[PDB]
Every structure is written in C-alpha cells, then in structure tokens.
Ligand binder design. Structure first.
Ligand SMILES: O=c1ccn([C@@H]2O[C@H](COP(=O)(O)OP(=O)(O)O)[C@@H](O)[C@H]2O)c(=O)[nH]1
Ligand SMILES: O=c1ccn([C@@H]2O[C@H](COP(=O)(O)OP(=O)(O)O)[C@@H](O)[C@H]2O)c(=O)[nH]1
Ligand SMILES: C#C[C@]1(CO)O[C@@H](n2ccc(N)nc2=O)C[C@@H]1O
Ligand SMILES: C#C[C@]1(CO)O[C@@H](n2ccc(N)nc2=O)C[C@@H]1O
Lengths: 232, 232
C-alpha cells in the first residue's frame, strides 16, 4: 500500500505537537514528521541556523521574514521527504502525519507576514516563485491525502503559548494569533482561500475542537481521526 | 547521444555573452543557456522580480545579497534544466553552453559577498545548505563535462563595464573586480579552491585570454573550443 499523508494544521500552541505525540504511540501503522521550526526552538547545522534566524525574525521580522520562511519550508520539504523514503515499510494501512505542511508555510505564515508588511512585494513574489518550483521539482510525493485541523481560539492559544514558555513567542500579541486564526478558518473551515495547487480543493478535511485540555482525555478526538482515515 | 554541458566562466564584462552569441551561430549542434541575471538588466514575473532585487542588491548589498543570490541560482537551475529538454538530443554531437554555473553563483559571487560582510554567517550557511541540498537532488543532470574560462584583467573588465553602461554596475569599484578575479584564478587556473562537488576536481578546463577584442577576430578562440570539445 502507498503511504497516506495527513497534515496536522492549527494555530500556534493549539496543541499539534501534543496530539501528534499521542497518535504515533497508538499504532505501528502511524508515523509522524515534526515541524523543523519547533525543533529549532527547543547542535546540528540546521538547528544552529534555525535557532539564529528564528530569533532574528522575532526580533526584526521586516529584515528576516523572507530568509526565515524560505529556510523553514526547505527544512520541512527535506524532513518530509526523508520520512517518506523510509518508514511504514510493511504496514498494511500506513499513515504519515505531517506537523503542518508546505501550504501553511506559504498560505498562512508567509502570506500573513506579507500582509503585515514584514515582506515587501518582491520578497513575496520571489518566495511564491521559489515555493512553486521548489514543490514540483522536489515535492510531488508530498501531496496530501487529507488534513486534520486542530481548531482552538486565539485566547486558548495565547494561554497555551504562556504555559509552554518559548522565549521568542512571549512577545506575540492576541492580534497576531487572531490574524493567523482568520487564515486557518478561511482555508480549512470555510475553504475560501484559493491556492496554486488545484488538488487541494478536493482534499478532505477533519476539524477538531481542541479548546478543552485533551492530554489525559483524547479518545473522542482519536476516534474521529480513525473514522476520517477510513473514508480516505 | 547525451548532451555535453560546458560552462563559460569569467569576471563581469570579460565577454561571456559576446562569445556565447558567436558560438551559438556556428553549429546547429551548439546551443546556449544565457545567465538569467543578465536578462534582468535587459515583462515576465522573473524579470520584474529580478530587476527589482538586482537594483536592491547593488543599492544595499548587506540587506539584499542573500535574497538576490538565492533567486539568481534558482533562476539559473530552472533555465538550465529547461534547455536540457530541447531537440538537441537528436543532433549528432550536441553541446550546451551554460553562461556561468551554479558553482560560480556559490564559490565566486555568494562567497565573495559573505567575505565582504554583505552576508552574515547564518545567511551564508543557510545559502550553502540550500545550495548543497537542491543541487544534490538533481544528481548528475547539470554536471559539467568541461569549463571554458574567459580570462580578462580587472582593468579590462572595469573599462568594459563602463562602455556597456548598465546602471546597477556603475557603482562597481576595481577592488570588487579584483576579488572576483582572485576567486576565478584560484578555482579555474591554480585549481586550489576546493568545493563540495568532488567531480569538479577532475573536470577539464580551457582558459582563453580575452583581453583583446575578439568580436570580429575569434577564429583562434573557437578553434581552441573545438579542439577542447574533441578531447571530452
Ligand atoms: O490539551 C492540551 C494541549 C496543549 N497543552 C500545552 O499547550 C502548549 C502548546 O502545545 P503544543 O506544543 O502541542 O502546541 P503546537 O504549537 O504544537 O500547536 C504546551 O505547553 C502543551 O503542553 C496542554 O497543556 N494541554
Ligand atoms: O571582444 C569584445 C568583447 C566584449 N566587448 C564589449 O565588452 C562589454 C562586456 O562584454 P559582455 O557583455 O559579453 O560581458 P559578460 O559580462 O557577458 O562577460 C560589452 O559591451 C561588449 O560589447 C567588446 O567590445 N569586445
Ligand atoms: C517557534 C515557533 C513556531 C513553531 O511552529 O514557528 C512559527 N512558524 C512556523 C512555520 C512557519 N512557516 N512560519 C512560522 O513563523 C510558528 C511558531 O511560533
Ligand atoms: C547585472 C549583472 C550581473 C550579470 O552577471 O550579475 C552579477 N551576478 C551574477 C551572478 C551572481 N551569482 N551574482 C552576481 O552578482 C554579475 C553582473 O554584474
């Protein structure tokens, strides 16, 4: 069987990493590609570069947005390709869970930075040009079979940012989370956001409310995932 | 027959474009991939973006070097891959002449910009990471059979820069052309500059002096090319 690729999407501190860590333990057919940027936050060359650029961006996003976004997406593509070529070898219903996708990189985060004037027009268009070609050449086997959207309120997310306590995030205001929320809702709940990838309009999406704490109590959430997978 | 891929290397205004435009006319087996950055100097989205970023970089290299260098290399890779799928396959002794290469992008220009402090360590390392990865995906497809190095003095080049009269180049001092010169000499003549691509240690190199005008007297240059090609 061909691996099913499922993206986990959601706002900052919505609980994607918690959820994906719960999933991977529940089945030998289920694997996980963590978001490289989250590992950066926390020795290696990528982590050192990622460390710096992530810190530089949150210090001055108008200087570093483009550099940061291109490296985050490159890193994602590479990690995601490394998991595909490998893993879920003999499994009967193999599922690979992506913590975010190349689409959320572009259409949530990079888009947002452009609209908040942290990227100018040249940077945005260069980025999009890069993204398009970077996809077709290297990322055709990354195409998604489905999307799981972890919906939390910006208020929950800001609270959860606090709990976690990554330094580079404690500066984030509710308004920034609200903008990111609006783009998640557009793309995933309403499905208004048009992309440059035609297949994404016919891609099935599961929306889960994750406002209530689920660390010790997730069985309902996982049952929905199982129902969803069975339709793919 | 597999297409032979030859890079034309040389400093700014050494006469690569002149020579490439003479070569293409002399054999129906001879084709040419122009440097995208040159075409940005002169409608398309690449040209618009290229125009802006080219102007931005020469206006403020410590802000724009990284962004410029990534988009120049992207653009070259795309054009070089695209030329590799023409009708030159069914010709007898097919040769594709690249105007500069991904190697000069990195080990001359980007290198020099980092050493001149127009890119910082993170920018430089990210660039290399991106360049390492994205080349090694296209294993062997753009690998060169040979290099032709058009050697002209920094002084000849500065003079030719003025005559040619591109806006963004009128700021270029002699010292800048001397650094680039040094890096050409190290790489292609002394062959001391070691790279990440080991096959480049063994790639044959033809050096041509082009200090003297050759626009109407180029037969000896071309004869050296043909002799060179026959040894490949
Ligand atoms: O039900 C939950 C979900 C998340 N969290 C905490 O909220 C923060 C954000 O979670 P996660 O790192 O998974 O979020 P992501 O940024 O990956 O969406 C962390 O401190 C989690 O331990 C929590 O306490 N309970
Ligand atoms: O034999 C020559 C070679 C070049 N040039 C001029 O020198 C400038 C630089 O040449 P080119 O644009 O080919 O340089 P490149 O930057 O492509 O190496 C241009 O104005 C050419 O017309 C010239 O007059 N005679
Ligand atoms: C630290 C951190 C995090 C971890 O997901 O990275 C930010 N991020 C992530 C992907 C992307 N394309 N752009 C971003 O800004 C969001 C968070 O704050
Ligand atoms: C205009 C112009 C030119 C045209 O070759 O572009 C500059 N260039 C080119 C390639 C590269 N990787 N970095 C550069 O800076 C050199 C010239 O000035």
């Amino acid at each position: 069987t061909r691996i099913k690729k499922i993206s986990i999407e959601g706002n900052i501190a919505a609980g994607k990493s918690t959820f994906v860590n719960i999933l991977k333990q529940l089945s030998e057919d289920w694997e996980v590609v963590p978001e490289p940027v989250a590992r950066w936050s926390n020795l290696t060359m990528e982590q050192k570069n990622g460390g710096n650029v992530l810190q530089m961006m949150y210090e001055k996003p108008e200087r570093w947005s483009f550099t940061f976004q291109t490296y985050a997406c490159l890193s994602r593509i590479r990690a995601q390709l490394a998991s595909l070529n490998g893993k879920l070898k003999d499994a009967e219903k193999p599922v690979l869970f992506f913590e975010r996708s190349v689409y959320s990189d572009r259409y949530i985060f990079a888009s947002n930075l452009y609209e908040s004037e942290s990227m100018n027009e040249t940077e945005w268009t260069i980025y999009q040009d890069w993204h398009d070609w970077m996809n077709n050449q290297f990322g055709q086997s990354l195409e998604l079979d489905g999307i799981i959207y972890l919906q939390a309120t910006p208020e929950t997310c800001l609270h959860r940012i606090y709990l976690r306590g990554r330094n580079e995030e404690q500066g984030i205001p509710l308004e920034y989370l609200e903008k990111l929320h609006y783009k998640h809702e557009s793309w995933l709940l309403h499905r208004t956001l048009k992309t440059n990838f035609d297949y994404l309009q016919e891609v099935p999406i599961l929306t889960l409310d994750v406002n209530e704490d689920f660390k010790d109590k997730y069985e309902s959430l996982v049952e929905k995932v199982k129902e969803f997978l069975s339709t793919l």
